[PDB]
Amino acid sequence: MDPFLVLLHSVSSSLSSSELTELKFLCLGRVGKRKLERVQSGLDLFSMLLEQNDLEPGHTELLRELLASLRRHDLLRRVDDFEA
Amino acid sequence: MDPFLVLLHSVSSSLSSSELTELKFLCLGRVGKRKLERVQSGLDLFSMLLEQNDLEPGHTELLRELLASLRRHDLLRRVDDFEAG
Amino acid sequence: MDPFLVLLHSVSSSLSSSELTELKFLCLGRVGKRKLERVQSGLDLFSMLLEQNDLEPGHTELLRELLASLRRHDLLRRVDDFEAG
Amino acid sequence: MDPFLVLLHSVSSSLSSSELTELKFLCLGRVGKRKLERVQSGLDLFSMLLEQNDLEPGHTELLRELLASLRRHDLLRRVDDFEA
Amino acid sequence: MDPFLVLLHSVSSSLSSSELTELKFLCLGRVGKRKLERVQSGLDLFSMLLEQNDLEPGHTELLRELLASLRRHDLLRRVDDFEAG
Amino acid sequence: MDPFLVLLHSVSSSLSSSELTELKFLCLGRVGKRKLERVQSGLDLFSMLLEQNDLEPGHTELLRELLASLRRHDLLRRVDDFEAG
Amino acid sequence: MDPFLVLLHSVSSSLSSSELTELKFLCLGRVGKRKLERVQSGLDLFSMLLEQNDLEPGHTELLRELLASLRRHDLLRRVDDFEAG
Amino acid sequence: MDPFLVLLHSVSSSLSSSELTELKFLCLGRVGKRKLERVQSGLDLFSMLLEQNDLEPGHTELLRELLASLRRHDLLRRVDDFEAGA
Amino acid sequence: MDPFLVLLHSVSSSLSSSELTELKFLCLGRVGKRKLERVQSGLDLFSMLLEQNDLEPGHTELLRELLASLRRHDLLRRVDDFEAGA
Amino acid sequence: MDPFLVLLHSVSSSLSSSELTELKFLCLGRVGKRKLERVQSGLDLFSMLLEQNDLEPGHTELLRELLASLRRHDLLRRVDDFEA
Amino acid sequence: MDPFLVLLHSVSSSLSSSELTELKFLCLGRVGKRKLERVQSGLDLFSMLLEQNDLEPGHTELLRELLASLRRHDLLRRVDDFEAGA
Amino acid sequence: MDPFLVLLHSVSSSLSSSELTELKFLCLGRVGKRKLERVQSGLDLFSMLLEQNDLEPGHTELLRELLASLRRHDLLRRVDDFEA
Amino acid sequence: MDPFLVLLHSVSSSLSSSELTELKFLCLGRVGKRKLERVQSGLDLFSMLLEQNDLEPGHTELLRELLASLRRHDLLRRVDDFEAGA
Amino acid sequence: MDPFLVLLHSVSSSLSSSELTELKFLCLGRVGKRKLERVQSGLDLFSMLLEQNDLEPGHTELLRELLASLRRHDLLRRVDDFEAGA
Amino acid sequence: MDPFLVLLHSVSSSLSSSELTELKFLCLGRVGKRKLERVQSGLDLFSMLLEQNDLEPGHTELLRELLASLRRHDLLRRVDDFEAG
Amino acid sequence: MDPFLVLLHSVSSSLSSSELTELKFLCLGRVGKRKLERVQSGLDLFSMLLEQNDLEPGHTELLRELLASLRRHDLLRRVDDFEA
Amino acid sequence: MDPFLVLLHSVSSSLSSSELTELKFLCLGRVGKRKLERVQSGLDLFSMLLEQNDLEPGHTELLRELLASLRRHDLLRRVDDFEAG
Amino acid sequence: MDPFLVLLHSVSSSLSSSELTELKFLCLGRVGKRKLERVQSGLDLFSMLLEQNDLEPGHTELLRELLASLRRHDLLRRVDDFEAGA
Amino acid sequence: MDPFLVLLHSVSSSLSSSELTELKFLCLGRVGKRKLERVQSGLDLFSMLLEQNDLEPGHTELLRELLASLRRHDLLRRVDDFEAGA
Amino acid sequence: MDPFLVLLHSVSSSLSSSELTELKFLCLGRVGKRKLERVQSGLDLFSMLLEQNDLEPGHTELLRELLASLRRHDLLRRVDDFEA
Amino acid sequence: MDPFLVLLHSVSSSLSSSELTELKFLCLGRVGKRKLERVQSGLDLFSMLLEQNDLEPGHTELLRELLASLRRHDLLRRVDDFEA
Amino acid sequence: MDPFLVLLHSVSSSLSSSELTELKFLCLGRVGKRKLERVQSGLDLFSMLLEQNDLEPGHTELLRELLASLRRHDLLRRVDDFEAGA
Amino acid sequence: MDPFLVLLHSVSSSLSSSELTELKFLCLGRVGKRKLERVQSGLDLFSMLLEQNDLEPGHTELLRELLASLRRHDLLRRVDDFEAGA
Amino acid sequence: MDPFLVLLHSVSSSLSSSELTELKFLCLGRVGKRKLERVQSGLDLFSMLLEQNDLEPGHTELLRELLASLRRHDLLRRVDDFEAGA
């Protein structure tokens, strides 16, 4: 399997609904309003960002900034362990 | 390619379901019930209005009226930017 | 652009869910149960009443009676303003 | 053009699918089961009833009864306007 | 117009979805499983029962039993009104 | 005209596609595959059965068995009315 | 030219293929199987019936029976108009 | 009139093209190819069978076998009715 | 002008080729094969039957039987009209 | 070159097989069966009608009736132009 | 030149083979078989009728009956013009 | 190239199947059932109307009525451009 | 009348042109080309066979072989009936 | 009528769409993809299984295995009742 | 009107959501997860149990055990009354 | 080798049966029925026309009229090339 | 009658159009294209194979191979029944 | 071989049925109905237009107009390539 | 009579029109064009070949080559049976 | 025997009836109608041309022109082989 | 019937919708987007993976990885029992 | 195997139904209404655009504009890789 | 037997009706219209081309061009094998 | 019979309609539009490719490319087994 897809699945498995709403608000300017209605979990948002080339195996600045804004410093360690 | 179609696509891609329902209610007297049953997004309604000669690159009064009735003042800026150029 | 539809939309935009339930109860003897099951907002009820010729641009008694029963006196002023002009 | 055909087309243009199903149920005793399977809009039903001499430019009682059973009075107003 | 079909249409117009599911459950031994999958309203079930010679203008006992099981005593009054006249 | 042909035409005019498919399956052991490929309505199947002497005015048992297997008790009444008179 | 041939041509010009197949089935006892294979329109069948003395200007009962069996009550009016006037 | 020729004419007047093709195939070992090329109806085949002494007013077994093979049980009744006239 | 020849001409002018072939088949026992080869219309067959005394202006049973076999009931009316007129 | 023959050729050149069959049915009481079996185009039927004095340069009523029965109103204009 | 012979030549020049056969059949009772076997054109039949005193310049009923039987109404106009001119 | 045929081809190229069904219904009194069974596109209907002298370069009222009944106001502009 | 000549006439009266052609081909090694050119019916061939003593009221083997080759089994019955009659 | 076909029709009239899809998946190794594309009810699959000699009046193991895999123990009773009668 | 289906309908009409969830948990080992996902009332579960030959008119042991596990002793009286008669 | 006979042979070598039938119909008033029965190709008709002094090396109007009536414009060019 | 021709007729009477197309494809290297164009049923193909001496009353390997490739075993049973006797 | 016929064959080998029907509609004023009934591919229409001198090796305006009406801009390039070489 | 003629008659009795056309094409370089116009069946072609000394009761190679070209392997067995019988 | 007569026999032995009719038409201006009525094969025509000194063993131009008109280029090779 | 198809059916009949969505996400780089839209149950995904030669009776590593990623350790026991 | 067709197939294999609907709306002015009704995947639209000379191996501006409008920036990388590789 | 005639027969045995129609179209300038009506197979066209000296055993360029235009590359190999064998 | 035809039949028996449409698109530049319009199964496409000499028992590269493009790796195993076992 692709180590990146496993990392994204593990990250999305550890979020609640309120953090999903905060992420949807923070991603307001990049994704259209019609598409944001269909987002019910983190996997859909990650798929859209992957399709728009906002997230790549090697370009993880946007994900790091979003996690820092959510004040979740335990998932950043997982991201860093994957990168290293 | 035809800038009017691009503008209509951009306007349509920024609506939710409730606003589409309000638009369908507001356009009740111009489109028949059987045709209105088949509308699932804004593109279909815009296509019907284009066919009936209600929307033209020079006649945008109906679109402005509908958008002002929906209280969406950010799309009116896009329409004004298109017409200005 | 029909102003009666605009007035109905504006009136429907100011109701909550409990008032909608009260209106559905009050209109129990005019609309069937299966049709009432599909009503989620005021626009659907107004569409049904328009179809049954219970609500007309010249006969607005039923709407006034419903609003008076709901103790909503700020919407009767809008109805009066519409029928004055 | 014949005004009667225009009136029938205008009436048929304002029906949904559920009302068509109700009309097909109500016309169960006059049309056979093989023919009713080919009806997709009101035009086919009106053509069959025209062929069987149930609808005529002078006799419109069956249409009025069906429209009264569907509780559509705005269409009955159209029929009254045509007759006058 | 056949009055029996009018009565059946009027009865079917006053049911909800859960009562339809209960009626489908109660008719498990008379209709096959493949045919019950296509029933979306009461008209289809009534048509099937009419074809299988379970419902007749002179034989209305099964309909009365089903209505009594659903605890709808207002529709039984309509059935009695039809039969008496 | 022949009453038997009128009866067969009346019976064939009341079937649908799925019932025709079921009849074609049930008549697998009497008609060949190449001949069954040409059957589009009930008239063709009845003509073939008439040719093979499986269906006569004095012998209507196979038709009764097929109709009973389709659970159509409103056509057996027609067959009984024809035979009684 | 002969008012009868014009009437027959007018009647035949208003039939589709399914009605032709129904007529061919109903006329199974009067015309042979080899001759019925050559029939593609109503004119051929009418010519055969004219030759066999089944259809005459003074005897039109079989035509009325066939048209009644097809439930085409508008062509019966044409036949009446021809006979009356 | 020969009650046999009338019967043969009546039988031939009730066949289509596919049944004629099937009969021509079944009669492949008795008639030559050049003669079978000229057959367009049942009469043209019955004439050859009469000439070759395969079909007689008292020997009708081949006709019954062919009709049974075609599964036409309503014509065997006509043949039986003719035979009952003796 | 013999009313019989006019009647025979009128009857012969209303037949197609398939009816002629059927008539040729039905007369297989009265006319030879070599003479039947030369028949192209109904006039030749009527001439041969007249020569062999099968058809006379007073005896017309064979013609009616053939016409009934062909199921042409509109020519039997012409024959009846001729018979009743004389 | 006779004007009438050219007109008949022009009229015959604009018909299909179904119209030929309808004309053969409509001309059933005037021509015998044996002769009608030989007709494959309009020229043969026109020749047979010419021989029987049904069609002449001064009497064109039968042709007009046939064309009116076939609902071909564009050839009646040609006939009228020839007559004028 | 004899006008009657010119008229007969004009009439005979406008016939086909089937019409000649029909005329020969209709003239069966007047001319013998052996003499009818030699006829290949209308001129021979007209010559035989002239010899038997059946066609005369003024006794022209048989020709009219034959032409009416053949349904040739355009040659009757030629005959009428000949009679009216003289 | 006759401009009228080009105009008719352009008009027919912009219709769908449901509009074709409505057009067939609206012409019930002018064309017989047997001929209407063989119509699959607008070209056949236009050919029949051309033959019956209902549609000619100087008379285009029936086409305007049909297009107005179908509520297609973008093809009436094409018709007007042709006429001018 | 000679019964043998009557039998030969009856047999020749039931043949067609193609069968005559096949008979001429089969009799190629007994008659010359110039004589075979003159044969138009079966009587001419029978006469030439008679003159050469190939056909005798007691020796009918060649005729039987020809008829068996043509697959005409209904004329062999006629020949057998004639032989048993004597 | 044949009891086996009646039993198969009765069994087929008691299945929904999900069960049909599961049966189509379970019969993947015996029927080709193009043929499985055309199956819309149970009769279409039973016909193919009958043609391939996987289902016979007495070889009912595959049907029982499929019904056991679908966990339908009310139809196995019908199968047992059918088998016990014979 | 099968007395058993009526009994099951009456029993199902007297349950709430928590009891339905408890029954779904207790029936974990006999029904698959994908099918238990679709259960919304007692009728759906009873249909599956009837299909798998676990519940029969002569064998009501599993139903009695499930009812006893919920401490619903009033419904056991209904079951006993049905069994007695 | 008279050029006129060669030209007539070349023209006759390019006609089918239907065109021959049309020519026979158009030449109905100039040649008798008994003579027209014998025509099987264009050479016979051309010989019959030559015998009656209707077709000459100087007077070819009838040939041009017939060819124009058949709508064959590639043979009129051959005639023009011969004449010039 | 020849037991072999009857067997071939019985085999040919139980094939559809698709199987005929597959047989024509499989017999591509034995029969020419112009002759394969004229084949409309199985009888023509069997006649051609009989003429080319590929099918004989004692040599039936090609027929068995073709039937095996079509996956029709009920017809191989018929061939076995013929050969066993 | 003639380049023009090869070009026409190549153009005709790239059309469907609907395009052929559209061409038949667009060519209503140049070819009669009886002739247009016989057209089943583009080769027949090209043959008729060649006979009427509407299509020539030096005059190709009608073909370009038809191809522009059908909106086929890939075949116009083939026509231009043919014309450039000559 | 002569076995070779019987064999040739039997072989020619099993051909059709298309096979005769193919044989005429294949024998193009041996028989002149004026003589091939008169051939209507195989007997005429066989007679011509017999006259030209291409076919003899001991030299049958050309016939075998023709039959092998037509792919008629059932007639080669008849030829082999004739050759082995003598 | 004379080689010229053998060559003429060989040439005549390869012509059908239609080619004979075409040759008779082409030789219309040299032989009378009554003499042409009696020709049934090429030998008669060649003998008639021989009597008139139109065909000689040193002057074969007419034969070459006739054969080239019939488009028989395989017989011209035989003629050339005889001449060489 | 194949012990492998029975095992796959048993595994598929024990999954819910959210697990199916997660499995669809994890197979993003092996199946195209157009084909993943038609997947409504596990049987379709298993059929696609069988056709692409990703699942065989001897190669069960991908299924084990997916099941371990879903944290379903009760189905891995079924897989092990099948293999043993 | 024409790399351009492979690229178009790969691009079409990565779209869904909604994106196809938006593409159909954006290509509203270049394809007629009758033709757009027959489009069920990207291959049909690509075929029409290839015929109308809007897509060529050297001209890919329209495809890039459509992909940019759909906001699919991963397929533009495939297009750029194809262009750079060739 | 002449190898060239056998080769032409083999080539003609593998063509269908549409290819024959295309071949007739491609030879519009070499054969007249009256002669092309009588062509029903490839043998007639080959015979005409042989007569006009367009097709010789040593000159086979036109046949190669026609077969290349039909895009039938499985027959060009047969032609090459014939040429290499000689 | 031929092992190659059996292999092609087996490969064609395991395709659906969408894969057939994709194959038709991928084979756009090798077959004409009018010919591609007549393809309803894989057998027709394989027959056309066999005629054009694109597919041979010794050359199977195009088939492998097409199958790899459809991402069907279970049929490539069958192709490899055929090539290795022979």
XYZ file of C-alpha atoms in Angstrom, chain H residues 3-83:
81
model
C -60.075 -36.788 -53.995
C -56.308 -37.315 -53.593
C -55.211 -34.263 -55.591
C -57.729 -32.124 -53.691
C -56.260 -33.362 -50.403
C -52.707 -32.646 -51.573
C -53.692 -29.141 -52.712
C -55.345 -28.438 -49.353
C -52.269 -29.675 -47.472
C -49.900 -27.617 -49.632
C -51.993 -24.464 -49.186
C -51.093 -24.347 -45.452
C -47.275 -24.180 -45.396
C -44.839 -21.269 -45.149
C -41.321 -20.846 -46.552
C -39.426 -22.202 -43.530
C -41.468 -25.422 -43.510
C -40.812 -25.808 -47.243
C -37.073 -25.436 -46.613
C -37.255 -28.055 -43.851
C -39.095 -30.460 -46.169
C -36.520 -29.904 -48.918
C -33.728 -30.695 -46.458
C -35.491 -33.835 -45.208
C -36.025 -35.086 -48.782
C -32.324 -34.703 -49.656
C -31.508 -38.382 -50.192
C -34.315 -39.092 -52.666
C -34.270 -36.192 -55.159
C -31.283 -34.767 -56.992
C -29.843 -31.320 -56.390
C -30.654 -29.963 -59.858
C -34.313 -30.963 -59.522
C -34.618 -29.674 -55.943
C -33.311 -26.295 -57.119
C -36.567 -25.713 -59.049
C -39.041 -26.318 -56.193
C -40.846 -23.155 -55.068
C -43.981 -24.633 -53.440
C -45.328 -27.905 -52.078
C -47.018 -28.892 -55.338
C -43.689 -28.976 -57.186
C -42.335 -31.458 -54.629
C -45.473 -33.600 -54.472
C -45.398 -33.959 -58.265
C -41.872 -35.405 -58.175
C -42.786 -37.717 -55.295
C -45.822 -38.931 -57.256
C -43.685 -39.574 -60.342
C -41.059 -41.556 -58.411
C -43.785 -43.789 -56.877
C -43.114 -42.759 -53.287
C -46.614 -41.302 -52.795
C -49.722 -43.275 -53.751
C -53.453 -43.125 -52.893
C -52.922 -46.195 -50.700
C -49.356 -45.670 -49.466
C -49.167 -42.512 -47.323
C -46.460 -43.403 -44.793
C -43.837 -40.929 -46.036
C -46.301 -38.024 -45.880
C -47.253 -38.948 -42.311
C -43.590 -39.188 -41.300
C -42.790 -35.775 -42.797
C -45.802 -34.136 -41.137
C -44.917 -35.723 -37.787
C -41.344 -34.444 -38.142
C -42.651 -30.920 -38.768
C -44.871 -31.295 -35.653
C -48.034 -30.341 -37.569
C -50.672 -32.414 -35.796
C -53.634 -30.567 -37.350
C -52.858 -31.856 -40.861
C -52.539 -35.473 -39.734
C -56.215 -35.193 -38.789
C -57.032 -34.206 -42.379
C -55.027 -37.171 -43.668
C -56.843 -39.485 -41.237
C -60.213 -38.108 -42.363
C -59.257 -38.859 -45.967
C -58.154 -42.391 -45.055
